[PDB]
Amino acid sequence: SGFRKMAFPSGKVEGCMVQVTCGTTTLNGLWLDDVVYCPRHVICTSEDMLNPNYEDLLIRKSNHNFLVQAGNVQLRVIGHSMQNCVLKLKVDTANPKTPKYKFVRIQPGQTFSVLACYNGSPSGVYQCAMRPNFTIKGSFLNGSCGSVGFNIDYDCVSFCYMHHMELPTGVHAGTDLEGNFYGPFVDRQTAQAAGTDTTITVNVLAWLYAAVINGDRWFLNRFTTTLNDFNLVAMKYNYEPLTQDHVDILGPLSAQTGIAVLDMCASLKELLQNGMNGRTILGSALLEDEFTPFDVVRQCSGVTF
Amino acid sequence: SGFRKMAFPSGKVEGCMVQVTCGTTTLNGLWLDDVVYCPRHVINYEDLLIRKSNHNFLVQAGNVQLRVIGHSMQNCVLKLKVDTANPKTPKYKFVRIQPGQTFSVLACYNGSPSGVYQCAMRPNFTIKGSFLNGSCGSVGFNIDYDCVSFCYMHHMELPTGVHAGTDLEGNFYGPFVDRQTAQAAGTDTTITVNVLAWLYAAVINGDRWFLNRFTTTLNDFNLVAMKYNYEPLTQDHVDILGPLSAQTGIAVLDMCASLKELLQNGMNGRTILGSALLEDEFTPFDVVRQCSGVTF
Numbered sequence: 001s002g003f004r005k006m007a008f009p010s011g012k013v014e015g016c017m018v019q020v021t022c023g024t025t026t027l028n029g030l031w032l033d034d035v036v037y038c039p040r041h042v043i044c045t046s047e048d049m050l051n052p053n054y055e056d057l058l059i060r061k062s063n064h065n066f067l068v069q070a071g072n073v074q075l076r077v078i079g080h081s082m083q084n085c086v087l088k089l090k091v092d093t094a095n096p097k098t099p100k101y102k103f104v105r106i107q108p109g110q111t112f113s114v115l116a117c118y119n120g121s122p123s124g125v126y127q128c129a130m131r132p133n134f135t136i137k138g139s140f141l142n143g144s145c146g147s148v149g150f151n152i153d154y155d156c157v158s159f160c161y162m163h164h165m166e167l168p169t170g171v172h173a174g175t176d177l178e179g180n181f182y183g184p185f186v187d188r189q190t191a192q193a194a195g196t197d198t199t200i201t202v203n204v205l206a207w208l209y210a211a212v213i214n215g216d217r218w219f220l221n222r223f224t225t226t227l228n229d230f231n232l233v234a235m236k237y238n239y240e241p242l243t244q245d246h247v248d249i250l251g252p253l254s255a256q257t258g259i260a261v262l263d264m265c266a267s268l269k270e271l272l273q274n275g276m277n278g279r280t281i282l283g284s285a286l287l288e289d290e291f292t293p294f295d296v297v298r299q300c301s302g303v304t305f
Numbered sequence: 306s307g308f309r310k311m312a313f314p315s316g317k318v319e320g321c322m323v324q325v326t327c328g329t330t331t332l333n334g335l336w337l338d339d340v341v342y343c344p345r346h347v348i349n350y351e352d353l354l355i356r357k358s359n360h361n362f363l364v365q366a367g368n369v370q371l372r373v374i375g376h377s378m379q380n381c382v383l384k385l386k387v388d389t390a391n392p393k394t395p396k397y398k399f400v401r402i403q404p405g406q407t408f409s410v411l412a413c414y415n416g417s418p419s420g421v422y423q424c425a426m427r428p429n430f431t432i433k434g435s436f437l438n439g440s441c442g443s444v445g446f447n448i449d450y451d452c453v454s455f456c457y458m459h460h461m462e463l464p465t466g467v468h469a470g471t472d473l474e475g476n477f478y479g480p481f482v483d484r485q486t487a488q489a490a491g492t493d494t495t496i497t498v499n500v501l502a503w504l505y506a507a508v509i510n511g512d513r514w515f516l517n518r519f520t521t522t523l524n525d526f527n528l529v530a531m532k533y534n535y536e537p538l539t540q541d542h543v544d545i546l547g548p549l550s551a552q553t554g555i556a557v558l559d560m561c562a563s564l565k566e567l568l569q570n571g572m573n574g575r576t577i578l579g580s581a582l583l584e585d586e587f588t589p590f591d592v593v594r595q596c597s598g599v600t601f
């Protein structure tokens with residue numbers, strides 16, 4: 001019993017964290033085999049960030065301008081290249097702690113664990129989701145750049161995020177491990193603002209099924225809804241549209257509890273209308289959207305209470 | 306910016322997790338040097354233990370079978386002497402925590418870590434964890450510098466869904482016993498010093514709507530807090546909040562007057578750090594650490 005925001009064990013990622021220094025800037029790098037991946041803005045000054053020409057800044061650099069530190073050992077850089085917004089530093093030593101891994105690009109609504117690092121040293125781990133506006137509501141201070149997001153399914157680490165910047169509202173933006181940003185963001189200091197955010201409807205529904213699995217049904221009602229009527233109501237509360245794919249994905253949880261997706265949609269509609277009336281669901285007074293249908297199946301029991 | 310329930314990096318503990326089987330029961334063990342620590346309920350415990358030999362205990366570390374060469378009991382923990390020292394043993398200490406203190410939990414099943422989360426020892430000595438059958442032997446810890454301080458080992462789930470366990474010396478937290486009997490968690494209370502720390506974290510992150518011009522006395526605050534099932538606030542708690550009071554310019558009894566107003570009026574449709582409830586699972590030290598950048 002119980003329901004917590006659980007992160008994946010971070011050990012496999014901790015053994016890949018390194019410190020990258022270029023001139024006066026120091027940030028984090030990910031060391032996999034003989035390559036260190038880090039944000040390309042490590043080659044920039046603060047002045048450069050207004051309109052940086054990365055190709056022009058990089059051509060003026062040699063291998064020995066990049067200092068890479070793994071624990072107490074200095075790694076020697078023997079090559080460098082840029083791939084989108086990521087700098088790839090070829091080093092002379094392969095990481096003996098390299099786990100089985102893949103680089104995966106996630107979609108909004110997907111969750112992942114973040115290992116927050118400073119000076120190549122891991123300080124904490126937390127779970128979060130890629131928001132519909134492509135930002136992440138993280139907890140990052142200056143020096144956290146290069147910190148990574150990941151999932152561990154079985155013994156394989158799937159890297160999905162690398163931290164690049166904080167936006168004026170305090171939310172965070174970054175790239176996949178191939179250097180492609182999530183969202184319409186650039187690694188430039190410009191008027192960049194996160195778009196209006198919305199609630200991840202399929203995740204709220206999954207969390208309502210998790211509450212039913214853990215023995216709580218006070219929020220159910222005797223109504224059903226069409227998918228269109230649900231979406232017309234949900235969009236008024238800034239909820240993401242629920243698609244037929246989302247209904248298909250909730251199928252297993254619907255069969256485990258005996259509550260049709262559209263009947264759970266009717267209960268969500270009523271919750272938006274009435275609020276909680278002093279009650280909580282899984283210890284929360286807000287509707288939670290950072291648990292996917294997959295996370296609920298992973299964490300919760302296969303037997304409903 | 307941002308404020309998350311953050312756990313310590315779990316790598317140092319992951320390298321200590323093993324699977325312990327005794328007959329039909331399978332649970333988790335902690336392998337430090339040549340000793341495996343696990344709940345004694347894996348097996349009248351003295352009478353059950355005397356009938357066991359070393360070969361009755363099967364210990365599995367990854368894909369390798371460890372050979373048990375001795376066994377002894379210390380309170381509610383079984384200590385299995387194995388023939389191999391753990392080469393991944395970190396620098397460690399066994400410490401007993403107090404209610405209100407927080408720690409990270411590495412939840413395991415069959416000796417394999419599945420997740421990590423942060424939680425607090427409640428005033429009623431239970432933990433609001435997330436554990437399924439097979440999680441027994443999962444451990445709680447903090448990391449200070451490069452040293453892992455083990456503070457909790459999971460033993461059982463209570464009828465309300467909350468969890469109970471021991472320190473690593475086998476002493477239960479709370480009035481619980483390791484057996485099937487009518488055991489219920491006492492009425493819980495809110496960890497006041499932690500709620501205050503989280504209010505200071507909200508001010509640091511730019512949330513001041515709850516701040517007011519008023520200040521209170523410690524006695525008046527405690528008379529009000531006792532009415533809402535909040536733990537009494539002591540002079541030690543006021544002293545401990547000193548650094549956060551100096552950083553934001555809000556005296557502790559100044560923040561107590563804000564908390565008193567939130568207790569009598571609620572939030573009025575507003576949130577603090579994305580929450581509609583007053584959060585009590587962040588200590589003053591956790592707030593200072595997450596708003597500073599301490600690494601391990």
Ligand SMILES: CC(=O)Nc1ccc2cncc(NC(=O)Cc3cccc(Cl)c3)c2c1
Binds near residue numbers: 164172187
């Ligand atoms: C003093 C300061 O920079 N504070 C914070 C606070 C919090 C921060 C959290 N994450 C990242 C930071 N770093 C950046 O945003 C550097 C950067 C600037 C301009 C564009 C880009 Cl692509 C990257 C943070 C920086």
Ligand SMILES: [Cl-]
Binds near residue numbers: 105106107110
């Ligand atoms: Cl995805």
